[PDB]
């Protein structure tokens, strides 16, 4: 028997699925969630081979040690031990589409188990032996005899080894399959793994048990009264003296209990359930949970006899809240949700995908530190631990059963056939079974991009019978079809229409309206976070904001997939697609979170942290209005501080404590400012710290900002000209200038800027230069798969055009003397194989006071594609420590990406202005600047722009971070313009037309000077 | 207006004349123009202007030059968006082409006069013997802005002496969306805070 080329054998004597269980024979206990001793952990070292093909294991192996095995930790994947080689494919599925076939060579883990059971466990009561996560298929042996099989590699598989275990020594015997019929539903985008990736424990239960139950909790309309109902499932031999009590507890107090025998209601015909009981308890004025204040009773189950003597028991936390739809939005506790919320999936760059509790609550703390207050469980069901963080930091979480067929054609092919009912029926079934009591979960999910079929129509249903409590989504086919509750589409865009045929992805502000339409919408996946990107992002919180029923969406994704490897001497870098040999591969299109594999945050965190802000602020005058976008809680750990500041320079500032209710309104009357004398834009900059210390945050952490623009007084004074006068020396070849002891030299030939002299050093190893184009982001690629091309993609425009081959031609080249300066004049026109892509004309003006006035206007032909950037470039000699700059910052922003970002005055290392993306590109940039400073130069007027040792050549030229090498100098790109970085998605042109460089003509100077 | 600079410099093959004024009202400077003109021996004129608009002023109606012209022809001819009358937010209609029309037909006869006749998208003006050449929004009558906004009825405006010009780099929007309230969406406003914009004067 195959049994992993059978859609139709999912498992072979598995146990049915439920809740969590710990077998506590101690209510109190129970009642803390103290370790059990009925809960035996079996991670650790394990024995293990690796094989082929299932048909190479030995016989032997079923009953001794293999001498070849090598001994390592579980739970691991076998990839991350380099057995073989990871694989990272998005769509196309790493095994030919043969269903149900695998192919023959299917690596095969063995891993095995020796350990000791105490003859307690086997005298009485219930032995079982449970695997939290097993890819991705799996036959288990015990003392050399078959116990099951079990399919699903994100759910728990567990099994009674009650006759197969002995006093003593025992030995486990695991056969994993990298391969099954059910990978032909988990061709999820991420790398494909195996092996017993998640915990594997024992745990002990009498032989009349608690085998599962159900916590739920009604309101009445105020939400000031509550009842919990609590249906408890026994198994083993029912007695008349036999009871349950469920009690509900608040910290340490109890505020509510029933008792009860077994027997439920008349259901039917037949009678009711002689081994069910629902337990109902009253509870007034019950403290609500949201993820705003996640408040948690706890509910603990006995089950026992008349007389007192305690069974077993079993718990869960309670938090008392309602979801549902009214009037086409989505309510918690009677409230419109509004969800800041992000896909993340379970990865580790050295453990792949094996989940520690560490990593994900620091995961959790970096969410809510920068506003988020949703999850998606992308694209399966979590590790358990997973839920009770959410449950008690406070995280709306979306349960999704682990279903993907996206690799299918066409999409719905296997989910519309009944002979896969049965597999994707139990991964959902059994998420639901096992999730079912965690507050944070407020919404089910059937999977992920595997069209729609109507498998999902009747797997949809389920639920809603099943689970009224929570809505139901799925983003198949179309987004709006009739297996979800939500219009949850996937990168749909803020204005424009994507008219795909068959599922188109229209305006979210457009689909709301549609004829007959009328459920809220909430997209599962947008802002596709690929390398430099999140461009728009604020345009889609606009939109949010403004309409009632546009209630969020989840942004793709977390955390980068990246793995890590290591070079001759040691040192790890960041891998991604095909770095281990594995092909067909997408490369680097695994890495598209808001943070790095290790955490680290990209700078497009903090501009969902700033969109996503809980406090919206109004300026009128003197006073400043601040409205609370919270639905439960008021300001209670808010203050507002104040401070306004002239061209950077400190003028005034001061704190305001904030005293708003949720959703109100609270009006600050700031003071009377002193009016500075300079001349100069004031400007004003508000935050709300947070002054106590949280669960997820510390004292003094600044959860959101403004800026304003106040009173500017225009220079109008003119400076004193000094009395020094530039001179002019001509040659056949060069115009030199100079002042004193300092030297500006422009080529005759070329027409650039060729050289500076301050006394004896050089100031340049490259020309000053105009620069027209980019080392293409992510978003200028636009693919979402390694093999396929795509002329429609900016950079493919950009290379057809001939804009990174473009020469520049003089046209003219001239020098004239003023009564304080020297002017040089120049025009060149870039060209392609005679067609002229941009002409720039420029005038240099240096006076006495040595300042070099640069005015730059370019002419950019209509019928060629619009440029990445337009302005100039230059390799400076010098390296300094520092840069400093009047502008936005202090992080890397772009013209669609810098509402988070401040003006003022920013200070940091060269090594800060450059952003490691794994897969190079441009980066660092930083807009609307009006002073740079780096060594002996300084740089003013109004441009963006970015500094490191690396030149946009090399940027473009290399595939990974850890293979760049800084150059001589210092590389300088001065924009005064600059296109939009996009990323509704990353596989279609995404910057939005007003930030493309599509005006034709453009305008820009700068003065460069020493300081 | 008032001057903070005047130079005059001469060239290989030109004479370049830098200027630069404040718009001041009760010591608040409003705004600031910076221009350069370039006569070179082929006797065309090269005008350059920079301007910097306070940003707490409120955004202007537009940004150009005036000047009323001693000629006074019978007709316009320009290389821009026409045939009729057409603003920022309101030259969907008016297509790019070479326009000839009598200057009676540059003034839109509104009952209660005001700012009328302005094509957009010039690349090219044509009135007697001058021409203008760049990128600008223009407007030519006999009525000047002032006799316009002081004046209630069209029945009562009189032909000035000579034709008034209004070149303009950049020009406010219209509204409309209702005309009791703000109604110029603010892609029409000109909030940029800095504004540049260059013409070539010249007789043909
Ligand atoms: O539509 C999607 O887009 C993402 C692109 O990175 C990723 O593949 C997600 O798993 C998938 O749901
Ligand atoms: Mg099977
Ligand atoms: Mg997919
Ligand atoms: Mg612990
Ligand atoms: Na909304
Ligand atoms: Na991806
Ligand atoms: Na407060
Ligand atoms: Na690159
Ligand atoms: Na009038």
């Not at 990168?491 to 188109?504: H, I, K, M, T």
């Not at 300092?742 to 070329?750: D, H, T, V």
Request: proline share 6%; aromatic share 10%.
């Amino acid at each position: 028997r195959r049994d992993w080329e059978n859609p139709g054998v999912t498992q072979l004597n598995r146990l049915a699925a439920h809740p969590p269980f710990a077998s506590w024979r101690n209510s109190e206990e129970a009642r803390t969630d103290r370790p059990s001793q009925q809960l035996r952990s079996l991670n650790g070292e394990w024995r293990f081979a690796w094989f082929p093909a299932p048909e190479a294991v030995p016989e032997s192996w079923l009953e001794c040690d293999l001498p070849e095995a090598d001994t390592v930790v579980v739970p691991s994947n076998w990839q991350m031990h380099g057995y073989d080689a990871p694989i990272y494919t998005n769509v196309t599925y790493p095994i030919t589409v043969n269903p149900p076939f695998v192919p023959t060579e299917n690596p095969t883990g063995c891993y095995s188990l020796t350990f000791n059971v105490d003859e307690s466990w086997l005298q009485e009561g219930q032995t079982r032996i449970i695997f939290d996560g097993v890819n991705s298929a799996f036959h288990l042996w015990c003392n050399g005899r078959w116990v099951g099989y079990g399919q699903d590699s994100r759910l728990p598989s567990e099994f009674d080894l009650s006759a197969f275990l002995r006093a003593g020594e025992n030995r486990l015997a695991v056969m994993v399959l990298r391969w099954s019929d059910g990978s032909y539903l988990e061709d999820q985008d991420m790398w494909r793994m195996s092996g017993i990736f998640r915990d594997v424990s024992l745990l002990h239960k009498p032989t009349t048990q608690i085998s599962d139950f159900h916590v739920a909790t009604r309101f009445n309309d105020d939400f000031s009264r509550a009842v919990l109902e609590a249906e408890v499932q026994m198994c083993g031999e029912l007695r008349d003296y036999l009871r349950v009590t469920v009690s509900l507890w608040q910290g340490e107090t109890q505020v509510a209990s029933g008792t009860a025998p077994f027997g439920g209601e008349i259901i039917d015909e037949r009678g009711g359930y002689a081994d069910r009981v629902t337990l109902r308890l009253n509870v007034e004025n019950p403290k609500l949970w949201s993820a705003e204040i996640p408040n948690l009773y706890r509910a603990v189950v006995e089950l026992h006899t008349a007389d007192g003597t305690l069974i077993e028991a079993e718990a869960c936390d309670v938090g008392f809240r309602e979801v549902r739809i009214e009037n086409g939005l989505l309510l918690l506790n009677g409230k419109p949700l509004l969800i800041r919320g992000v896909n993340r999936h379970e990865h580790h760059p050295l453990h792949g995908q094996v989940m520690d509790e560490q990593t994900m609550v620091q995961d959790i703390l970096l969410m809510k530190q920068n506003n988020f207050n949703a999850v998606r469980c992308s694209h399966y069901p979590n590790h358990p631990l997973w839920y009770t963080l959410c449950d008690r930091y406070g995280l709306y979480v979306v349960d999704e059963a682990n279903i993907e067929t996206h690799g299918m054609v066409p999409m719905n092919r296997l989910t519309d056939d009944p002979r896969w009912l049965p597999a994707m029926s139990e991964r959902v079934t059994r998420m639901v079974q096992r999730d079912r009591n965690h507050p944070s979960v407020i919404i089910w999910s059937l999977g992920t991009e595997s069209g729609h079929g109507a498998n999902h129509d009747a797997l949809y249903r389920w639920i809603k019978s099943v689970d009224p409590s929570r809505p139901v989504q799925y983003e198949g086919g179309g987004a709006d079809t009739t297996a979800t509750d939500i219009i949850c589409p996937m990168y749909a865009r803020v204005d424009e229409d994507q008219p795909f045929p068959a599922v188109p992805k229209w305006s979210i502000k457009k689909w709301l309206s549609l004829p007959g339409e009328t459920r809220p919408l909430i997209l599962c996946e947008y802002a596709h976070a690929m390398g430099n990107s999140l461009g728009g992002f604020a345009k889609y919180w606009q939109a949010f904001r403004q309409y009632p029923r546009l209630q969020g969406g989840f942004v793709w994704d977390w955390v980068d997939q990246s793995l890590i490897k290591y070079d001759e001497n040691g040192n790890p870098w960041s891998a991604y697609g095909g770095d281990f040999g594995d092909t067909p591969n997408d490369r680097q299109f695994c890495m598209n979170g808001l943070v790095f594999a290790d955490r680290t945050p990209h700078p497009a965190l903090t501009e969902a942290k700033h969109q996503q802000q809980f406090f919206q602020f109004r300026l009128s005058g003197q006073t400043i209005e601040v409205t609370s976008e919270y639905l439960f809680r008021h300001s209670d750990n808010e203050l507002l501080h104040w401070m306004v500041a002239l061209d950077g320079k400190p003028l005034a500032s001061g704190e305001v404590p904030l005293d708003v209710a949720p959703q109100g309104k609270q009006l600050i009357e700031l003071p009377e400012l002193p009016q500075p004398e300079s001349a100069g834009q004031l400007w004003l900059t508000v935050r709300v710290v947070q002054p106590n210390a949280t669960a997820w945050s510390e004292a003094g952490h600044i959860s959101a900002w403004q800026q304003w623009r106040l009173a500017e007084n225009l220079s109008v004074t003119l400076p004193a000209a000094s009395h020094a006068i530039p001179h002019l020396t001509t040659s056949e070849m060069d115009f030199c200038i100079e002042l004193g002891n300092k030297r500006w030299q422009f080529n005759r030939q070329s027409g650039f800027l060729s050289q500076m002299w301050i006394g004896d050093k050089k100031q340049l190893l490259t020309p000053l230069r105009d620069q027209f184009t980019r080392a293409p982001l992510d978003n200028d690629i636009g693919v979402s798969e390694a093999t396929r091309i795509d002329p429609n993609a900016w950079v493919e425009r950009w290379k057809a055009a001939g804009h990174y081959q473009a020469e520049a031609a003089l046209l003219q080249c001239t020098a004239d003397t003023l009564a304080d300066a020297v002017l040089i004049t120049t025009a060149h026109a870039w060209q392609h194989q005679g067609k002229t892509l941009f002409i720039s004309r420029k005038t240099y003006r240096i006076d006495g006071s040595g300042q070099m006035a640069i005015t730059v206007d370019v002419e950019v032909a209509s019928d060629t594609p619009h440029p990445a950037r337009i302005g100039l470039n230059c390799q400076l000699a010098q390296v300094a420590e520092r840069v400093n700059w009047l502008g936005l910052g202090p992080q890397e922003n772009y013209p669609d990406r810098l509402t988070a970002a401040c003006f003022d005055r920013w200070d940091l290392p060269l090594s800060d202005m450059y952003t490691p993306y794994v897969f190079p590109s441009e980066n660092g940039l930083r807009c609307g600047t009006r002073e740079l400073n780096y060594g002996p130069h300084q740089w003013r007027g109004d441009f963006q722009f970015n500094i490191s040792r690396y030149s946009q050549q090399q940027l473009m030229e290399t595939s990974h971070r850890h293979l760049l090498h800084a150059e001589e100098g210092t590389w300088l790109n001065i924009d005064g313009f600059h296109m939009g970085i996009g990323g509704d998605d990353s596989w279609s042109p995404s910057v939005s037309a007003e930030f493309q460089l599509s005006a034709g003509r453009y305008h820009y100077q700068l003065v460069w000077c020493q300081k």
